[PDB]
Amino acid sequence: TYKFVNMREPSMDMKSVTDRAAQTLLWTELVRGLGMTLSYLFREPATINYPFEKGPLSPRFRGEHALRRYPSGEERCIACKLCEAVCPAQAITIEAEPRADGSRRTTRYDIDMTKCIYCGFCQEACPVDAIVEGPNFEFSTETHEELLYNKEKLLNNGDKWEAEIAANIQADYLYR
């Protein structure tokens, strides 16, 4: 079905003609717009008092990246390169070798945060919940190089944000 947005004609009776003439000579719709703006003036603003008040977020939010650990302290990442394979922007560089104790662990785990599109594919493809996107989003820097994270930086992010990351994963893991 369909409807006509504008196909109505005005009645030509004397009362309606006089009403339209009063609207033309006395700016009735303009006064109506003024009244609407005045109402909005006397309403309460929708502004939050940042940085003392923060906009709402969800457990699924994709912010800064982090490399997680098992509760024993062992790194979760097993150098499987699924995140590197699935990364759309090719932001992840991974190099690995057998460790001293024979573990399959990474030696280089770089993420170019100026190349990443924050799409969350890396944490979807991780089978051990190693790489995650944390809740942090206020990590702007003054130089370009500071946004080229490496394995040490990502492990520091994980250690710094482990509690909130764990809480969010606990909250949202049953939907995955």
């Binding site: 603003p45 929708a46 502004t47 939050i48 940042y50 940085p51 923060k54 906009g55 800064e64 759309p88 922007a89 090719q90 170019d112 945060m113 100026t114 190349k115 990443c116 599109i117 924050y118 799409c119 989003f137 206020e138 990590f139 702007s140 820097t141 003054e142 130089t143 370009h144 500071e146 946004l147």
Partner: protein, 156 residues
Amino acid sequence: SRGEYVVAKLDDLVNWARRSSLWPMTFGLACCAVEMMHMAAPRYDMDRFGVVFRASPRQSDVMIVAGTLTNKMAPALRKVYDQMPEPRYVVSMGSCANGGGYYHYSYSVVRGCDRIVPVDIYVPGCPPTAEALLYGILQLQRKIKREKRLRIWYRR
């Protein structure tokens, strides 16, 4: 010293005015400019802080490079940056402006607006949220707070 105290107070006053009155040029390139509009929106009102969009580059203090910078667009961005009078600052926003972004390995995309203009602040994200951009703006303000031009000149 008396002169040192005078110049310190004077360039505290000067940095306060520039920090508190920021006029971004009305300049957006791609999806990152929508978050600029949402930062201008009532929720994160940028006009509270003294941050006001001005259309003319002559009446602009900050260039927010929000979007992908292409080979066909780089000359215009450089031109408007040059036509901006000093002191002037640059805030790159989003992955495309920071480095290459989703289009890093492209024939028609500049891998970083810092290849074109000197960038003062980098805001990460795709797109960075309006709160992230506001944090970047406040970080730029704090960076301005530390400038000591009269103090450098006095000891020069």
